[PDB]
Paper text:
Lipoprotein lipase (LPL) is a secreted enzyme that is active in the capillaries, where it hydrolyzes triglycerides found in chylomicrons and very low-density lipoproteins (VLDL) to release FFA, which are transported across the capillary endothelial membrane as a source of energy. In addition to acting on triglycerides, LPL has phospholipase activity, making it essential to regulate where and when LPL is active to prevent off-target hydrolysis events. Active LPL is needed to prevent hypertriglyceridemia, which is a risk factor for cardiovascular disease (CVD). Independent from its role hydrolyzing triglycerides, LPL on TRLs mediates lipoprotein remnant uptake by the liver.
Using cryogenic electron microscopy (cryoEM), we determined the structure of an active LPL dimer at 3.9 Å resolution. The structure shows that LPL forms a homodimer associated at the C-terminal domains (“tails”) of both subunits. The active LPL dimer is oriented with both its substrate recognizing tryptophan loops and active sites facing the same direction, suggesting an active conformation that could be engaged with a TRL substrate. Analysis of the homodimerization interface shows significant overlap with the LPL/GPIHBP1 interface and the LPL helical interfaces. This suggests that LPL homodimerization, binding to GPIHBP1, and LPL helix formation are all mutually exclusive states. Indeed, we see that the density corresponding to the lid residues in our map are shifted away from the opening of the active site. We thus analyzed the LPL active site in the structure and found a clearly defined pore traversing LPL which is directly adjacent to the active site residues. The pore in the dimer structure has a bottleneck with a radius of 1.4 Å, which is sufficient for the carbon hydrogen backbone of a fatty acid. The pore has a highly hydrophobic section that could accommodate a fatty acid tail, potentially aligning the hydrolysable ester bond with the active site residues in a relatively more hydrophilic section of the pore entrance.
Author numbering:
A (entry chain B), B (entry chain A): 36 to 246, 267 to 470
Write the structure that this text describes.
């Protein structure tokens, strides 16, 4: 052996939940005999990240079961961070480059022991483990092809240098998921910067409101539910900022302005640190569909903004939605607005649109159980997947805005 | 003069509400000078019917306004029943044939005074006036072409002879409207027999539930709203009985099994005293659309009938309906039922069907807020107008019957 590794190794098997089946000893010894290894196989390696107490991360069994059922003949290896974990948090950040040197010796081992092509390997991890993976990928003699960092750490790595962090040149393709950008960068965990080729801000990137501490457990749950549901990947959209995407002007994707999420990013490289966006549900598998609208208003009386309590329903060929309350901070005459539609079901082909503006909490009455209304019609839509430039229309009576008991309907017409 | 008429005559004008403008004196005197008459015109004559007190029927101004706006250059003439009215009710029935002889001398007058072709005249009336009109049409030397009797009388004319009543041979085409067949034939007003070529039983023919006495008054209202709305006549359907039509097996009209109502009966004669049916609304103009359904049930558990509290909604291209509660006295597994859909609006082309079986009054709970349900799908429909043999289908989840909060949806499919 060259550098005596203190971290114990474990090449895991699908018949293993939360223990070690086969320990791979360091040094150039027997490796394929005790631990099963296939050269014509997939090698996805993980790093256990920062643990405050002495505990192995409880989400490993569902993890290794998910990657083993997703890909047969898989070589999954985990390292023990607890050999150099139970110390101070910046001191653990100091030990990140030593464990990076350890995994550096690891992928330098079979580079000449087995002469691996290193074009079929995967490296992934979270918190300080993803940072050590980025350091190791920065060190690499032969450039690694893929890395999916999960939710990284915070105030230890502030304006650090590129070999000491994740970088686009650290791999052929770098992906990252900032679940938790909430709070101060110098205090809270999470970096507010597009550190990789692509970066994700799920549920706005601040925090998932499902409510444990709910910051990296999400980042592994959406990844495992992305890789299980391989036939319908979640479609992320390139945009400029959080609120610009929330208004919904970044859902065209006529050119490369949108891509998938999770395991398959469709192998698009040479990126300019662009911002890529999603919304998500909470505690059911996360395949939220997206839609954007182009609403039109009219009226010569020129009334102004009052309230944001509006609800809309949707009926379609495949499924149905009851009601989705939303918030529009500006509403007036002769103006076009837009807001996002996040749906838990696949509506599919469209027939008609249902609208219910009761506003029961925020000014339902408005001085005669009715508001001074506008005339609403010619609402256009755009689907978050593929393209749908279709034209709708309204009818005569229910184009008027009315506060409470207002079942406004819409209808498709093509002429 | 041959027979000195006691009834005063009035050839009415559109500038007349409830009075006499021009009195036409009896006997062969001047007739076209004082009262305006055009030979190339339409002559629709009326008879004021039975009045308990001394009163001219208050619905004459809207009547004569409606026939004058419907047909320009119209010769409308009314007689005074009050000359021989204010006596006993069978004694008034005795005077019906004397006023029939009076109007007999009337249409025998210009048969040789002006040599009228008598193929452009109309005779109409109600209560005993329609009976006297039938007697006069039975007497006629040249056969009259048209008569629209309104709601006739009751116990005076029970199993009477054909010259003493309305009959198919009394005219070329005889129409009648039994609004009120409720009660005993020997006590209540109204005959329970197809006295004419066609007969109508509106709202089942018992009574219109709009709630005055609400009987004959209703009759004249549906006739005037039929003649005002000439572009969309109410479509009556030939059937066998009241409940057979109420179940809805008489709405095909592939052959002559349906016709219009009001003024225009499409000139179909030589009838075999068939029963012809309608439903109607109350105190708005009466153009109720009709639909019939072919619902299918399934299930091997073989559950039986419990309740009849079901509600259904309809969404379409043109309009919408909120909910229409109905009653089905038999519901079970693997059985096909049918019930009528009476709508106040024109739904038009169809997209999808909405069903809400809350049954909040009649057993909404059913021991766990849910009932042991059936699987429902493949519902066919048939429009009351023209034909619509279209095929629909259901989806996977909401085919199950559930008591309360049950938004069952349906979808059109053609493959």
């Amino acid at each position: 052996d060259f550098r005596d590794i203190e971290s114990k190794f474990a090449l895991r098997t699908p018949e293993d939940t939360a223990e070690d089946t086969c320990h791979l000893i360091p040094g150039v010894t027997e490796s394929v005999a005790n631990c099963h290894f296939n050269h014509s196989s997939k090698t996805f390696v993980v790093i256990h990240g920062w643990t405050v107490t002495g505990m192995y991360e409880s989400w490993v069994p569902k993890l290794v079961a998910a990657l083993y059922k997703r890909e047969p003949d898989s070589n999954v290896i985990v390292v023990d961070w607890l050999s150099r974990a139970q110390q101070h948090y910046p001191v653990s950040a100091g030990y990140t480059k030593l464990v990076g040197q350890d995994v550096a010796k690891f992928m330098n081992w079979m580079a000449d022991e087995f002469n691996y092509p290193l074009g079929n390997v995967h490296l992934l991890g979270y918190s300080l483990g993803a940072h050590a993976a980025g350091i190791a990928g920065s060190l690499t003699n032969k450039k690694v092809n893929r890395i999916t960092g999960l939710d990284p750490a915070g105030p230890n790595f502030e304006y650090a240098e590129a070999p000491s962090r994740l970088s686009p040149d650290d791999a052929d393709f770098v992906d990252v998921l900032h679940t938790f950008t909430r709070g101060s960068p110098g205090r809270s965990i999470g970096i507010q910067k597009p550190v990789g080729h692509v970066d994700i801000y799920p549920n706005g990137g601040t925090f998932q409101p499902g409510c444990v501490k709910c910051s990296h457990e999400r980042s592994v749950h959406l990844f495992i539910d992305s890789l299980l549901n391989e036939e319908n990947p979640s479609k992320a959209y390139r945009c400029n900022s959080k609120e610009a995407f929330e208004k919904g002007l970044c859902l065209s994707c006529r050119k490369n302005r949108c891509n998938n999420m999770g395991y398959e990013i469709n192998k698009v490289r040479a990126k300019r640190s662009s911002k890529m966006y999603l919304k998500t549900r909470s505690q059911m598998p996360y395949k939220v569909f997206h839609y954007q609208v182009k609403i039109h208003f009219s009226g010569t009386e020129s009334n102004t903004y009052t309230n944001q309590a509006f609800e809309i329903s949707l009926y379609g060929t495949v499924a149905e939605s009851e009601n989705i309350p939303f918030t529009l901070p500006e509403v007036s005459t002769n103006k076009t607005y837009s807001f996002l539609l996040y749906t838990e079901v696949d509506i599919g082909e469209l027939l008609m649109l249902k609208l219910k503006w009761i506003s029961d909490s925020y000014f339902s009455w408005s001085n005669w159980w009715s508001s001074p209304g506008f005339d609403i019609g010619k609402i256009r839509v755009k689907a978050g997947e593929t393209q749908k430039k279709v034209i709708f229309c309204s009818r005569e009576k229910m184009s008027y805005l009315q506060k409470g008991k207002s079942p406004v309907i819409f209808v498709k017409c093509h002429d």
